[PDB]
Design a protein that fits this description.
Six copies of one chain form a homohexamer. The first copy, chain A, is α/β, with parallel strands linked by helices and about 250 residues long. Chain A has one domain: 3-Layer(aba) Sandwich (Rossmann fold), CATH 3.40.50.1580. Chain A is about 25% helix and about 25% strand. In chain A, strand 3 and strand 4 form a beta hairpin. The interface between C and D is large, with 54 and 50 residues. Chains A, B, C, D, E, F: Belongs to the PNP/UDP phosphorylase family. Chains A, B, C, D, E, F: One of its GO terms (molecular function) is identical protein binding. Chains A, B, C, D, E, F: Keywords: Cytoplasm, Glycosyltransferase, Transferase.
Chain lengths: ~250, ~250, ~250, ~250, ~250, ~250
């Protein structure tokens, strides 16, 4: 089993030009959406879950990509992006929250994540912290002040499966949960704001070399309040979190 | 209807018409190649990473869903099809072998996998075994012997990362994966036949009720005797497996 | 000096005479009853809890050598047999099923085991699966079916101690049952059929290569009732799993 | 469902006849050599690895039951005994020390044992000290002194199988372990005495309330020197340590 | 002083008056030197290891306290203080760099520590990140700006014992573990700047509703190169370091 | 203080005279106090709780030094002392018992410690027992029972926390406790008697090195039996545990 260099993504080094910055959301039907709030946004490729788009932001280029679900999908998009020339990864998602005071619509800026995945352990072992960059968390927290969004800074728990423990989640069971049942109220007490699944790998890769990674979200859901949130409200959440990371980036370029 | 909180697959119990058995491939591109050998192929409501089709096999609606990359997505889909009604699951994919007695074109059926990953642990302790099911496995060997293809029954090893370590495969050196500074010559000497990323996760999640999960793969590469992959081996090899999984699928109805 | 640093259990050289299979019950007082069922059954050697007899099937030699309790004895036995040349093993014992629908006078066939021993880890990491060989496992399924028996097949939990967890058993207490406290309800609900003590070792230390091992089992009791046991028919099930163990070897010769 | 699962091959309470101490050897033959030394020795029964004798000592009854191999069977012994009534257990066997200064025909006392087994984990966590009892030990040392043996009070390495060292001993290997080999000058640099198979387990099943478990071994070899054999010296070490144990035992009950 | 319920060497709820912010350095001398750059410096109680001074910054109650040595003392200092109402905790230290690009005089502010200590695990699972509060960390760097000192914000290693791995030290010949023995050269290739023994614990608590925490430490010596230091200057390293924490405390009352 | 080249908080052999023994309590106040019972007690030094008196007893200069809190301060004021030739240590302090049959004011003797701390692991792996040296340990009980002091010999849980497991221990709180939930009752049922912070690092360190380590202490609190204390205890137990340490080192010299 030999090979010849690589395969995946679609990028060529020369495409993205000399971008350096990368915004990596999860969902591919959201990459064009972010690239729109910018100038001269182009489609670069769409090689299965990994959807690239370029744009300029004040004369300076910025790459909006797509990662997929789970740490494994992410670690690929990132491994190849970092080699293409990228040294800054800004992520925007729309998570759900485990804290009662956190309302739907608010922003979440992840200083660091509780590692509950298995891909991150390939980069740096379960002792090294999954910590976000400082200029990256700064840009995003101050850029959210210049948008007027009740931002929440803190810890996010990124899992390898659709968020264990209690919670509620109409959890499909009968054979309950494994060594993860009472883990939900535990994190909840430890001031962990939200669950999610890709940062453990994003942050820990970056942290452990070059780096400058950061995560920004938007609570589209909270495991307690009913009707939360009405559809119109849900999507209105997805927008502000894009203005903030495109804006965060303008402050890093 | 569903909106926030869970949703995931564009699916409803109604849309399966019984099913109970679903063949789950890697890329969605492959699913339709499978859905060919069968009658009345209706493409079901796709989504990100997870496709879903339905078809006739001896007058029994059977279904074909893609699972995405690795275990996190693999688990999501399983977690979601099971609910709908699917009890039995068979996975097909083309991999490469590590034993120099398994030439490209040989059909590897898995009975048990080396749990070397993280999503499995959400479903069982490291200790429980991730084994195929007796009824399912049998059929795959029986089918395979009917088309006279070099079946090999054994163990597979599931990494939760893109075949890295030190058998020249992409992730990056320097740090490597700490507690496993030895692997290739140590999975070899144990009789592991090939390396992949969703196998463990699927077998472990199943031997819990859905206990009906087998796995067959097509050797498309092999490092130990690297040279033999001549012309488009990938053809016969990818097609042989698609005849076997549909044949096995019919024995289990 | 080595006064033959090995001077261990059993015969030496060609007393087997080409045999390559071996039914390894746990009791010595059963090595007689078994070989008696073959043709021309001669006694070969004897050591504590180690009795070997040579008998034959359809013109082939088949040895029947007992292994003793727990895994540290089992290890030795195996290491000796395969050294002398046996390549296939057939174990059969008697267990106490933990599932309700099982019931007495039923044969259980193990696809793989849930490793709660310690000796197996001297062979393989806790990731390597404790799995039964295919050919071997099938024969026991085709032997039982063709003898008039109710055969349940699946997973067994091999305990290094006379089963902890939290079931009916008495016990002196002290600290009571450590962090195995809820392991009963767990495995029970995860679909393990019963507990044994020598499976995880044998299975794991064969599944590598030169595996070829399987396990038969007569259900002498259930740990989920308030009705039986049968009384005189209990041993009567011994004489049931034995024709089956005898049948499987004739089929593997 | 009065499923008498009560006594996994053994005896009745009156059999014990008010016994409270019990010297637990390893094999049936060393039981009879031990109970030869006490008053009016009676064979109570013999079933599988377990041969129980009844003796007297200063008019006081002393159970002498054989453990078998490794910690698995031993745990059934101590647990069956205790159940019938023993509160204090003394272990005795022969051993080869790994410490250079530790000569042959040199008895060794074990204050604590290095885990490395697997059944103890069924009693107390790896964190918990598998420790000898205070009384049972001084009794042991107070005996070694009165017999004239160079006693080496200390710690012992107890792994229920092979001792991880690519040694001058004998290593049957095709494929072995995961992350081990630290049994060479490692456990020897930490000044450990011998290699057991039953101590870590005995000690931990006892130290966890209702202890009184001491162990003494007679050194028959020294892995770091070749000059040997010497006919009866091992039988004389067999004789050395057996007196130390019967004699120690008297001081206890 | 003991009393009813508790008296673990500290002071009263009143001596603090305002409480809220505390500056926590190691040695008790440093305390006297830190409060001196503030007015109304009152001494309170040097009750063993932890010496508490109270002063006032910009007109409000402020407190300096020594933590002790390592995570267990760091942990007793933070508990009794938090009980009295202290929310913010700043750490001023002097360190050694393992980065060849961080000469003396430099200032290192810490984002998150690698949890190679025993003290943190008492607070969160191993997966938890010991990261500093955004506020004190921004304040730190901004403070360290109004002085002009070259700062580096980053990942600090926190274990027990003085600088692990292999340094030009005196590894006393009485045990040291190989499972940590080689990683310093790993942590540098991981981009971690410096070592310490109190951070991992300080951070993992506080992060757990213990409210806020952040750390600043000047560079008095780099191992990577020899020519440094100018061992005259150093007085002023701690100087600016001591001025920086005051500035940062001011920005947080 | 310390020094540029390994030198650290202590002194020199040049003023140690006859090394070998050391009585290492907690406080810096205790040193002089225990020292005020020997012969020709002179003060020798004093740093962060590392006070040292080089007192005499029956002819031998029996140094009394201090460790401070936790394994890390200990390890230093232990390992550097060792380098001065103190190859035998006796630990004295105070402590809170957990068995309900232990009254405030009776010395406890630690045979070995449950390893709940992080420094120990640097001296030996978790499996190696934090075991106390039989010689030191024997003298200890000889002494207590000698003066009727109600000695208890047993295991001791050694936490790097402040005696975990919890109960109405009060504290800031919020998140109850980590996995030390009910950990205390699990230790009680498992017979452990008291909690402590540095017997772990000490017993372990000395146990795999030069050797010899002892550990006594007094009981001013029972974390169950509320009715503090036995008469008024506190200051009386200081005397009853300290006597034993001089009476007891006066057998090792």
């Amino acid at each position: 089993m030999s090979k010849s260099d690589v395969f995946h993504l679609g990028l060529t080094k020369n495409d993205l030009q000399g971008a350096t910055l990368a915004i990596v959301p999860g969902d591919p039907d959201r990459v064009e959406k972010i690239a729109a709030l910018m100038d001269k946004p182009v489609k670069l490729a769409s090689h299965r879950e990994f959807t690239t788009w370029r744009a300029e932001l004040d004369g300076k280029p910025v790459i909006v990509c797509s990662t997929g679900i789970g740490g494994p999908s992410t670690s690929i998009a990132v491994e190849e992006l970092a080699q293409l020339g990228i040294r800054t990864f800004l992520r925007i998602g729309t998570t759900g929250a485990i804290q009662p005071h956190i309302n739907v619509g608010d922003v979440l800026v992840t200083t660091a994540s509780v590692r509950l995945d298995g891909a991150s352990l390939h980069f740096a072992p379960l002792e090294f912290p999954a910590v976000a960059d400082f200029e990256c968390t700064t840009a995003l927290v101050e850029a959210a002040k210049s948008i007027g969004a009740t931002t929440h800074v803190g810890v996010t728990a990124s899992s390898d499966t659709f968020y264990p423990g209690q919670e509620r989640y109409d959890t499909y069971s009968g054979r309950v949960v494994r060594h993860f049942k009472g883990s939900m109220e535990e994190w909840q007490a430890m001031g962990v704001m939200n669950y999610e699944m890709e940062s453990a790998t994003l942050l820990t890769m970056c942290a452990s070399q070059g780096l400058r990674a950061g995560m920004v979200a938007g609570v589209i859901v909270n495991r307690t309040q009913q009707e939360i949130p009405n559809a119109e409200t849900m999507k209105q959440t997805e927008s502000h979190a894009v203005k903030i990371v495109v804006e965060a980036a303008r402050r890093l370029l």
